[PDB]
Amino acid sequence: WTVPTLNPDTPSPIFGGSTGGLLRKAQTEEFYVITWEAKKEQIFEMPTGGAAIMRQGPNLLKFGKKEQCLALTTQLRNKFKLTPCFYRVFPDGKVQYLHPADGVYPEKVNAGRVGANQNMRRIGQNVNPIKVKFSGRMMSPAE
Amino acid sequence: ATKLFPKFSQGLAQDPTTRRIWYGLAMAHDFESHDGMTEENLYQKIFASHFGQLSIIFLWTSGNLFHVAWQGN
Amino acid sequence: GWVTFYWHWKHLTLWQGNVAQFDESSTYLMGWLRDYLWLNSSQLINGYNPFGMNSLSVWAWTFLFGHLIYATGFMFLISWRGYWQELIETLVWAHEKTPLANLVYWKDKPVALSIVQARLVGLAHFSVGYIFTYAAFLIASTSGRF
Amino acid sequence: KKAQVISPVNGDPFVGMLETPVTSAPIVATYLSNLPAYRTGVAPVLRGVEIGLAHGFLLAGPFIKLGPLRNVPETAEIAGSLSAAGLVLILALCLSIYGSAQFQSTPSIGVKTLSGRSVARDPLFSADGWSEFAAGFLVGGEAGVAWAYVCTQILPYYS
Amino acid sequence: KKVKIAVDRNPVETSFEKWAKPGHFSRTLSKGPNTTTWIWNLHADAHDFDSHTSDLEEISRKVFSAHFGQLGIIFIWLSGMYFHGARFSNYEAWLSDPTHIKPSAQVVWPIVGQEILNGDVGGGFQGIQITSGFFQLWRASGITSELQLYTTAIGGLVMAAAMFFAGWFHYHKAAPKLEWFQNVESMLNHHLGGLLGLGSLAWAGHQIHVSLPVNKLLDAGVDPKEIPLPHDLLLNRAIMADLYPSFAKGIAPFFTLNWSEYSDFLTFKGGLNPVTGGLWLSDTAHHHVAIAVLFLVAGHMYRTNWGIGHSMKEILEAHRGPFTGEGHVGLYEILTTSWHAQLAINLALFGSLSIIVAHHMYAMPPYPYLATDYGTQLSLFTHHTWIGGFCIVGAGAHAAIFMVRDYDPTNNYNNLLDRVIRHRDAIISHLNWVCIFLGFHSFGLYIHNDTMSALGRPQDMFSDTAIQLQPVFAQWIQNTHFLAPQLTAPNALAATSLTWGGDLVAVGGKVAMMPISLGTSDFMVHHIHAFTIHVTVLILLKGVLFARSSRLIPDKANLGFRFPCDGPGRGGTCQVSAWDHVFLGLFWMYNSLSIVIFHFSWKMQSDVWGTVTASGVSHITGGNFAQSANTINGWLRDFLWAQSSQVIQSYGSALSAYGLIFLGAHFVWAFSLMFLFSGRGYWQELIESIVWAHNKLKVAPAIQPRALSITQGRAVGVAHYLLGGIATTWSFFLARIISVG
Amino acid sequence: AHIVKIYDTCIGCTQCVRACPLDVLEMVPWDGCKASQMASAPRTEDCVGCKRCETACPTDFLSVRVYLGSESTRSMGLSY
Amino acid sequence: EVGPKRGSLVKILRPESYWFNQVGKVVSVDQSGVRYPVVVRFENQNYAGVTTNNYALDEVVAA
Ligand code: CLA
Ligand code: CLA
Ligand code: CLA
Ligand code: CLA
Ligand code: CLA
Ligand SMILES: CC1=C(/C=C/C(C)=C/C=C/C(C)=C/C=C/C=C(C)/C=C/C=C(C)/C=C/C2=C(C)CCCC2(C)C)C(C)(C)CCC1
Ligand SMILES: CC1=C(C/C=C(\C)CCC[C@H](C)CCC[C@H](C)CCCC(C)C)C(=O)c2ccccc2C1=O
Ligand SMILES: CC1=C(C/C=C(\C)CCC[C@H](C)CCC[C@H](C)CCCC(C)C)C(=O)c2ccccc2C1=O
Ligand code: SF4
Ligand code: SF4
């Protein structure tokens, strides 16, 4: 598996237009693009509001928030049994792949993804906040 | 981008929302949760703040005295 | 509030020579309502009427002021963040899509008051209204008689 | 059953504005495009003068007919015009501090015009542009309040 | 044939086996309790039939039999009121003198000193003065005897037992299938022809044959003992042809379409009866004849088994516009598939109807001596107003529940519901703006008047004197309905109400109904009404449209309808659910209707109700509403402080219980604030520190003590808030108006 | 950014990852408390702080722990 | 083998546990080098609704 490049030639589902779509965050900070290959035309539920019709084949869809993309991801994975993958697009054109960051979905092991933010102690073996006092910023004993 | 108002907290100064203003108004005197605060600097800022409270109290009594003397009977 | 109600009524009945009214009515709570809160509000709330006003009108206005602030704290105390954040999402849409007004844009993103923050804000509105209401009532019901 | 009126904005169903007769009727878009706010090629100082003249002329009326001195015959218009002058001054200060606050980032994304041609950014949305816009707003607002007073003084059927 | 009876024989066995096993209706609670939250969930999910199972047939059967149980309970309650009017009332004494004797139908036992509550109401009676208006209703029915109330009570108990037998039958013995419930064409045809058409026709028959002659003789001074019994007015046509000579013609004028001959008992008089202060029963009889015809022709509209008629699916599907996409398609399926979509509409219109009832029962008092019982009139406005607001909030609730559970986006593509959910942001944004606009321009007017009159500038207030905001549109409508019989309703002898204008009707010295003027105070309070209504609509509609998703939480539908929060994340997500929007819409419904009923009470006591002893109408508060209600201090002083003198000095008198429920309601309301201001996590730790003391003494229960759910805390808080506030208002109203009115 | 720490009491039931609506958590093999999986939080820049993860953690209390930290646009669920 | 038997009653010594100083019954003890190997089932459920939890050999004690 290798990181897929975002295809802009991918069509979008049949949506009649909403008001829950993109805001100035898309133009200024960032927005998100989710893609998936469908086997048929199915009326799914937009996380922004309203129902859209996915197209037979590949689809592409814009969203202003990552939680929207993962909501649709779990909806397409659980109700339609698809395998979508979304990105993070910046207004200058930079695309950043996000969800299956190793190819497989994060609930499954991949035999090589590194464990981050793992405290190797018990939650009661954390120190008292008096020991992490005056560490610069206000810091939790979990660090 | 990163703002300037919460000089005492860099996590708030990077907040893009209106929460920065409020939480900087309400974390201003929690000196021990400031950025880069030591214990000695804490005690010193508290010393100066007590001096400021004293000045304010005495100005308040001066104002009561002044207004009773001026606009009172 | 209980402490100061007790003090104020005991002393209003002492100063008026009517300690018997307290000795009779303070043993039940309709006594405290009627003979203390309802009775002694007579000049306060008539501080201003459609016929005119007197010097107690400031304390009447302040009375109603505290009644407003207290109840406004109820808004931050009962309604919680998530109704208001979605409301503000709608208002963000409304501002970004309104012509001649999307020209003007915020620099700080409008979000609802946080949980702890609105707890403090409701407590502050509550306390200010409590305090102002009782201060107005006290000063007006004591200055109106004496 | 054909001929649906409501369309998405510029054909994009994911942006979220839903082009609608109140939004993008020919007459409505014509009127909004002709307003000095949306004349992104003219100098912002003059658009500010025009906007300020309008707003300073309209907001004298309330202070005149509803102010505290509305019932004394000749002092009413003077009082309301001075009040509108003060409010225009306050608004000009608001505009100046808004220009201080907003225009520091210079966002790099372009602007199109619902037909593809990449127009330039409005010089109004720049620090110097908004400075001169608030200058024009002050000048035009005070002038419009003064002329509102004048129109109370000279108009025949001013009741 | 399509529309037919379709039932299953003996679906559910009748046994107490599932009575001994609580929580049987769900898969989670049937395992048994381990924590106390189970005890609350057992009750919160008791009638949540659409989560006990998925098949709409069993849900529908449960709903049907539950409705039967509600009907049986309503019949028990009605029979109880008739029985209390038969045994424990002064009704037969009140009929002889309804202008002097207070209607009472509840006697209190003399146990712990509450015999003081058995007030001197009149007619040699001692009891609690009722305000439900049953005496006026019974006089209008033509009862005139306690035996008829007794037998009506026994008939109500018979019908209650019948309804409960019917629920048991239609659940356990022969329960209908889903395709029987789904015949909405037949249900509407029948509920319009037979239920509301034939019901109004039968009530018209009673009004022709029993109410009209009995009440005509009652108004002619005849003693209720010497009035002919209704069966004697049925058999002996001579009595009726003496009272109405058109009964000498028989029913021929009907079949010959010489209906004008019937103009003796089918009238269009309009206005009020000068001797009773209520609507003419001939007017009501003609009314019910007319609406019976109307509903019987309206019940022949939909197509059931013979090709004539309409398919509601065809009306809906063929109603679509260029602005609205596919239109009403899929709504037939929504409403024949979702019980909650039906419940939402039905509750909304039923509550709006109850408020219609409240407004139309005081301006057009239908019953004799109803208007001059100011307590009954005030209570009957307040009660139905409150029931309407509650039903409307429940309509918003069940609309949200539909949107969460029963909504399917496949059925709804570019139909009206999809197109609403797609632009909910425009909807709620404009609603927010109008709520803010109205709040400012309706309450800041009151604040402006408070500030002006406090500063001593009454010439700067918003009053009928200084700066007039006259309600010219309502004034024009008043004048348009006052002048209606002259031009636009020539066969009406008078206007519908005297509130439009004209002369007053005073009965027994008391004012039954008089013209109602509207000025700046009425403008301001009406705009306050619209403001509060719009905010309640904002909350409930925002809960509906954002019940599945928002820009904050896109997966709110999977979270559910009733959930506290997703977390403290996204800055904090508490009360994002569509349940918490109902929880807040309850508060705003209370705030709206409190002002509505306050407007009613003050306007009635100031500008309508009163006595005429000499030449001059002397009202209760002296018409202060015009000049005093421009300020919040006005509603304080001259309404909440002035009209509270009767409830706080009621101690030691018959109305002392009203003062008691004043104080206790103030208690309960404030008690609600323990649940609304606080949060579960504090009480769980307090509870576990208490459980430590219970463990130490070996008295810790097996059912683990938990703090109430978050949702349950909010529900308890809103319940205690509404109860205390409404009961405080109830006590205040009744104690005030039983004394001064 | 909020602080999500995961402790060695994690029995590896994947529930915290399935509950996460922002794809902050993932399950790493054997480079943790033991073999047979373990969780991890590499993408905490996208954590909003909803604590669905520790709502779904079945261990005593919570192996996964969200400590609410400095907010941003990604950590406040803002589409604006 | 390590730990208690697979039906024994066990008092939990984990300080942050809901069942601290509370008796539980062993479901099983994983005989690998796993940390927190002891699986204890409790008659009463915690605030999350769980009745089972994994504990270490030093967090368990008889009776
Ligand atoms: C005595 C006769 C009888 C018997 C033995 C049963 C037995 C059963 N019924 Mg049937 N049922 C009956 C009569 C009976 N029913 C009647 C008369 C009705 C019409 C209302 C129904 C309608 C009905 C439905 C719709 C359902 C059942 C169900 C059930 C099962 C469990 C019910 C349960 O938990 O009961 C215990 C419940 C109660 C004791 C509640 C009684 C509520 C009464 C009616 C109203 C009282 C309200 C009260 C006035 C409020 C006071 C307020 C207070 C604060 C003062 C069981 C097979 C359920 C089933 O099959 O699910 C598997 C089911 O869904 N029954
Ligand atoms: C002329 C025919 C007719 C009449 C009078 C009614 C009347 C009623 N129906 Mg409807 N219904 C009908 C036809 C009719 N229905 C048909 C054909 C269907 C199939 C589509 C339905 C399906 C239906 C459902 C699904 C529900 C009702 C409900 C109701 C009741 C609503 C409660 C109310 O308004 O209080 C008014 C109360 C009264 C007027 C009290 C007297 C009731 C009398 C005794 C029964 C009416 C006659 C009855 C329908 C015929 C059978 C008599 C029986 C001896 C066999 C009401 C009694 C609801 C209800 O309350 O359920 C219990 C409900 O859930 N009905
Ligand atoms: C549902 C409403 C209703 C009902 C029930 C009645 C009933 C009655 N009206 Mg009224 N009426 C009504 C509405 C109603 N009215 C309205 C709306 C108007 C205004 C137009 C009038 C205007 C009016 C006038 C002007 C008069 C009446 C009269 C009558 C009576 C004569 C009936 C008659 O001649 O019709 C004929 C009806 C039938 C032939 C049906 C009889 C059916 C029987 C009962 C069948 C049962 C037999 C059974 C199968 C077997 C026996 C069982 C056992 C013994 C073995 C009767 C009491 C007359 C009267 O007596 O005045 C007091 C009269 O003069 N009515
Ligand atoms: C025709 C009327 C009607 C019908 C059939 C329903 C039916 C239903 N509603 Mg809806 N609802 C209604 C009116 C109605 N509601 C109204 C008027 C409101 C506004 C208050 C609501 C608000 C509402 C909400 C917010 C919710 C429901 C829910 C439900 C479902 C389960 C209700 C349940 O189990 O409660 C069982 C009964 C109780 C728990 C008793 C409540 C206790 C009350 C508050 C006590 C106070 C009442 C008393 C008169 C005051 C005196 C107290 C005295 C005892 C001291 C069920 C489908 C729930 C649902 O479907 O969610 C999944 C839900 O969350 N309803
Ligand atoms: C007295 C108590 C109080 C007050 C003033 C408010 C005020 C408001 N609520 Mg809240 N609310 C409260 C209690 C209160 N609420 C309680 C107890 C609950 C139950 C939980 C709620 C639940 C609730 C919900 C659920 C909603 C509201 C909404 C609203 C707004 C609608 C009205 C509006 O914008 O008009 C304009 C503002 C007012 C009328 C407030 C008074 C201001 C006056 C006019 C003077 C202005 C002063 C002026 C600017 C001078 C400034 C002086 C300078 C020195 C600063 C407003 C902010 C709604 C909302 O935000 O959407 C629109 C909404 O959806 N509230
Ligand atoms: C609102 C309400 C109420 C009340 C109500 C009422 C009162 C109603 C009524 C209703 C009604 C009052 C109804 C009625 C109905 C009736 C019917 C349904 C009848 C039927 C009959 C029939 C069906 C017959 C037939 C026939 C004959 C026998 C003659 C010949 C021909 C024929 C065959 C046709 C209350 C407050 C309590 C509560 C709440 C709710
Ligand atoms: C009304 C309301 C809002 C909306 C309030 C908005 C977001 C902010 C208030 C609007 C402006 C900023 C009012 C400012 C007026 C103050 C007088 C400013 C004084 C502060 C200075 C002294 C610094 C919430 O965000 C909320 C959150 C959680 C629980 C309850 C509530 C709640 O009740
Ligand atoms: C007071 C309070 C509590 C504590 C209330 C406790 C848990 C329950 C109150 C009393 C219960 C119902 C015990 C009453 C007695 C039992 C019904 C058993 C009967 C035994 C004899 C008395 C007959 C909360 O749990 C809570 C949660 C969320 C928001 C606000 C609050 C809140 O305000
Ligand atoms: S708080 Fe929410 S977003 Fe953050 S890690 Fe936990 S579940 Fe994921
Ligand atoms: S839910 Fe808890 S136990 Fe399960 S994998 Fe996540 S952190 Fe570990």
Curated annotation (Swiss-Prot), chain A:
Protein name: Photosystem I reaction center subunit II, chloroplastic
Ranges annotated as spanning the membrane: none
Annotated family: Belongs to the PsaD family.
Keyword tags: Chloroplast, Membrane, Photosynthesis, Photosystem I, Plastid, Thylakoid, Transit peptide
Residues of the full protein shown: 53 to 195 of 196
Gene: psaD
Organism: Chlamydomonas reinhardtii
Chief location of this protein within or outside the cell: plastid
Domain of life: Eukaryota
Membrane topology designation: Peripheral membrane protein
UniProtKB/Swiss-Prot annotation, chain C:
Subcellular location: Plastid, Chloroplast thylakoid membrane
Transmembrane segments: 56-78, 120-140
Residue numbers binding chlorophyll a B1: H67
Residues reported to bind chlorophyll a B3: M75, Y83
Resulting phenotype, H67 to C/G/N/S: Contains somewhat decreased amounts of PSI, depending on the strain; significantly changes the spin density of the P700+ cation radical
Superkingdom of the organism of origin: Eukaryota
Effect of W84F: Still able to photoaccumulate an electron on A1
Consequence of substituting H67Q: Impairment of P700 function. More severe
Residues annotated as binding phylloquinone: W84
Subunit annotation: The PsaA/B heterodimer binds the P700 chlorophyll special pair and subsequent electron acceptors. PSI consists of a core antenna complex that captures photons, and an electron transfer chain that converts photonic excitation into a charge separation. The eukaryotic PSI reaction center is composed of at least 11 subunits.
Similarity comment text for this entry: Belongs to the PsaA/PsaB family.
Protein name: Photosystem I P700 chlorophyll a apoprotein A2
Organism annotation: Chlamydomonas reinhardtii
Organism classification: Eukaryota, Viridiplantae, Chlorophyta, core chlorophytes, Chlorophyceae
Gene for this chain: psaB
Residues of the full protein shown: 589 to 734 of 735
Curated annotation (Swiss-Prot), chain F:
Residue sites binding [4Fe-4S] cluster 1 per the record: C10, C13, C16, C57
Compartments (UniProt record): Plastid, Chloroplast thylakoid membrane
GO cellular component annotations of the record: chloroplast thylakoid membrane; photosystem I
Key words, A-Z: 4Fe-4S, Chloroplast, Electron transport, Iron, Iron-sulfur, Membrane, Metal-binding, Oxidoreductase, Photosynthesis, Photosystem I, Plastid, Repeat, Thylakoid, Transport
Cofactor binding notes: Binds 2 [4Fe-4S] clusters. Cluster 2 is most probably the spectroscopically characterized electron acceptor FA and cluster 1 is most probably FB.
Keyword Zinc belongs to the record: no
PROSITE patterns from the UniProt entry: 4FE4S_FER_1 (PS00198), 4FE4S_FER_2 (PS51379)
Domain 4Fe-4S ferredoxin-type: 1-30, 38-67
Pfam family, one: Fer4_7
EC number of the protein: 1.97.1.12
Matches recorded under SUPFAM superfamilies: 4Fe-4S ferredoxins (SSF54862)
Membrane topology: Peripheral membrane protein
Binding partners and assembly: The eukaryotic PSI reaction center is composed of at least 11 subunits.
UniProt-recorded name of the protein: Photosystem I iron-sulfur center
Annotated organism of origin: Chlamydomonas reinhardtii
Upper classification of the organism: Eukaryota, Viridiplantae, Chlorophyta, core chlorophytes, Chlorophyceae
Curated annotation (Swiss-Prot), chain G:
Keywords on record: Chloroplast, Membrane, Photosynthesis, Photosystem I, Plastid, Thylakoid, Transit peptide
Topology of this chain in the membrane: Peripheral membrane protein
Recorded superkingdom: Eukaryota
GO cellular component, one term: photosystem I reaction center
General function of this protein: Stabilizes the interaction between PsaC and the PSI core, assists the docking of the ferredoxin to PSI and interacts with ferredoxin-NADP oxidoreductase.
The protein's assembly and partners: Interacts with ALB3.1, which is essential for its insertion into thylakoid membrane.
Protein name: Photosystem I reaction center subunit IV, chloroplastic
Lineage of the organism: Eukaryota, Viridiplantae, Chlorophyta, core chlorophytes, Chlorophyceae
Gene name as annotated: PSAE
Entire protein: shown range: 34 to 96 of 97
